[model samples]
Target: GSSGSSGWCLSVHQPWASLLVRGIKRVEGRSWYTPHRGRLWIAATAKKPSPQEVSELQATYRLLRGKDVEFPNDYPSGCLLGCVDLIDCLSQKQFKEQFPDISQESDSPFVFICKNPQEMVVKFPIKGNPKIWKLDSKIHQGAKKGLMKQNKAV
Candidate 1:
C-alpha cells in the first residue's frame, strides 16, 4: 500500500494546482503537517477558479516574483496534473522567515515546501479526493511513462 517508487498524490484547487504543476508555485499551505516527502503527485480539484480568484493569485505572483502568469483557456479539473518533490514542512512563522516572497502568496498554519516540478504530458483523468491518496494503477503506469520520460531519456 505504501510505496515510494510510485509516490503519493494530493488534490488541490484550480489555479494553485496548476501553478504547482507548472512550477510557478513553490509552497503549498495546509492545515496539517505532512511527514511523507518526495515525489508527490498533483491533482486539480473539480471546481474551476473564478475570474476574481484567478486574477488575485496572478496579482500575488506579479507582486512577489515580478512575473505574470498566463492562464490556460481551459483549466482542467478532476485530473492529475504533475508531480513535485515535497522537500520540507514548516510553521507559518518559520516559512515567513525563510521564504518571505512565498509568504505573500500562500499563508497558513503549515506550509509544504515544493521543488522539482514535472508536469504530466497528459492530464490523466482521475476522481480527486481530499488529503493524500494513492495513485490509480493505470495513472501510476502513465506517470512512469510520461512524467519520467525526460529523466529517462537524459
Candidate 2:
C-alpha cells in the first residue's frame, strides 16, 4: 500500500535473502516495511504534499548531497543500473586520500558522477532550510554507521 501526494512507488530488496529476515526484525515497528525482496519498502501518494512533506523530501535530498548515494547518472557507459557509494566513502577519509594522485588544487582533480563540481562548490553552502537540512544530516549519520561497520570488518 502507498500513501501521499504523488502516486510514487517505493520498494526494498536485500542483497542476500537471509539478511532480509534479520533486517525486518531490526526495523520492526519503524516505518520500514518488508518488500518483495530481502529489503524493506515504503510507498505513498499525495495529491499535493504538505509543507512538512516537502521539507522531508528536501531534507532527504540535501542529506544525500555530497554523500556517496548513487543516482541513475552515475553509471558508466553500458554498465548495469545500480548504485554505488564511492563518493560518500571517499569524502569521509580526507579529500586527499580520495585523490592521492591528483593535486587538490588541480582544475579537475576528481570527477564526481552525481554532482556537477561547479554547482556543488557554489550552491551547496548558500542553500538553507533547517527541516530538510536536519533530515539530510540524519540520513548521512545512517550512512556513516554503515561505513563504520564496513571499516570494522575490513
Candidate 3:
C-alpha cells in the first residue's frame, strides 16, 4: 500500500514467516506505516529472524496451538480478528496455561507497508462494534488510506 508516492513493502518467506505473514496481512494492511525515512519498507521473510522476533513468533505459535483455544462460530472468513479473539480468550484463562513461557511482559511488533493506496483495509472490531470485522471493499478501490472512520457497523 502506498500514499502520496510514499509507502512500505512486504515480502514473505516459508514456514514461520509464512504463517506470521498471513496474520499480518489479514490485519488489512494496517500493520505498517511510513517512517520518517520516507517509504520505510517493512516485510517478513524466512531467511533469518532476529532472536527477539523468533522468540516472539514461537510464543505466538504456542498460543495458536493451545488445545483450549476456541474461535467464535461467527468469525468472518479471511479475517484475523478470529485469531485475535482466540488470543484474548486464552489470555483470560489460567496464567500458567495461557502464556506458558511467554509472560504478559513480552512484546512482539508486527509491521507492514502499503505501497499503493489501493492496498489498505480497515481494522476489525470497530471501537464500539465488535461484530463488524472488515471495511467495505469500495473504500479501498482508490488510493491507500488509513482508518477514516470510527465506530462504524458492517
Candidate 4:
C-alpha cells in the first residue's frame, strides 16, 4: 500500500452547504457517487444565490424538515463551511429501498449518507473544486482547527 497523507473535500453551494454542515441535511444528493468513506470537508461555492434560490431553499427545508427554518442573513462563499462523516453512497434505487425517509426528501440519482456534522466557527477561505478533491495539509490543519475551536470554548 502507498504511504502518503490525504484528505477528502467536497464543494457544495450555500444554503445547502450550511444545511449539511449544520446537521439538518443528513443526506447529500448528487448525480455522481463516491466510494471513499471518512471525514469529508465541505466547502461552499463562490456562487452567490439569487433571492429566488434562497426562497426555494427555505421552502424545500420547510417541506422536508417541517415548519419554518431560518438561514443566515448572509451566506459566505469560497470557503470551508464544515465537515461530515461520509459513511455510505448508494444508488437511488438502493437508497430508496434502504433509506426510505431520505428518499422521500430527495430525488437525486445518488445519495451520500452523512453523519456527525461539525460547523467551523471561523470559516477558512479556500477555492472550490468540482466533485471530490484532495486537501493540502495546510488547509487540512487550518480547517481542522476551525472545527476544534468551536466546541472547545464551550
Say which candidate scores most in TM-score: 1
| Candidates 1 and 2, the one with greater TM-score | 1
Candidate 3's C-alpha runs over 4 A off are: 5-8, 12-16, 24-60, 64-154
Global lDDT scores for all candidate models = 0.77, 0.22, 0.28, 0.77
Residue 78 alpha-carbon offset, candidate 4, angstroms = 0.7
lDDT of 1: 0.77
Kindly list the per-residue Cα lDDT of model 4 for residues 34-122, writing each as its tens digit.
88788898888898767786788778777777755445556788998888898898778988899877785556788888898878888
Candidate 4 TM-score over all chains jointly: 0.83
lDDT of 1 by residue, 55-103 (tens): 8877767666566544444578999888889998877888888987677
Clashing residue pairs in candidate 3 (N, C-alpha, C atoms within 3 angstroms)? 1-114, 1-115, 1-116, 2-114, 2-115, 2-116, 117-143, 117-144
Local error of candidate 1 at 148, Å?
5.8
Taking all chains together, each candidate's TM-score versus the true structure is: 0.85, 0.18, 0.23, 0.83
What is the per-residue lDDT of model 3 for residues 13-119, given as tens digits with 9 covering 90 to 100? 32232233233222212222323223322223324445565456456554655533222111122221111111121221232254444333222232222221121
Instruction: Go through the candidates in order and give the C-alpha RMSD of each one to the true structure.
Output: 3.7, 19.7, 14.3, 3.1
Better of 1 and 3 by TM-score: 1
Ten-residue stretch with the least lDDT total in model 2: 115-124
Kindly list the per-residue Cα lDDT of model 2 for residues 1-154, writing each as its tens digit: 7523221112112211111111111111112222222212121111223455334433443343323322221111111111121122122123336544422212222222111111010101112111111213433334224322221111
Sort the candidates on lDDT, descending order. 4, 1, 3, 2
| Model 1: lowest-lDDT 10 consecutive positions | 145-154
Off by over 4 Å in 4: 1-5, 68-70, 149-154
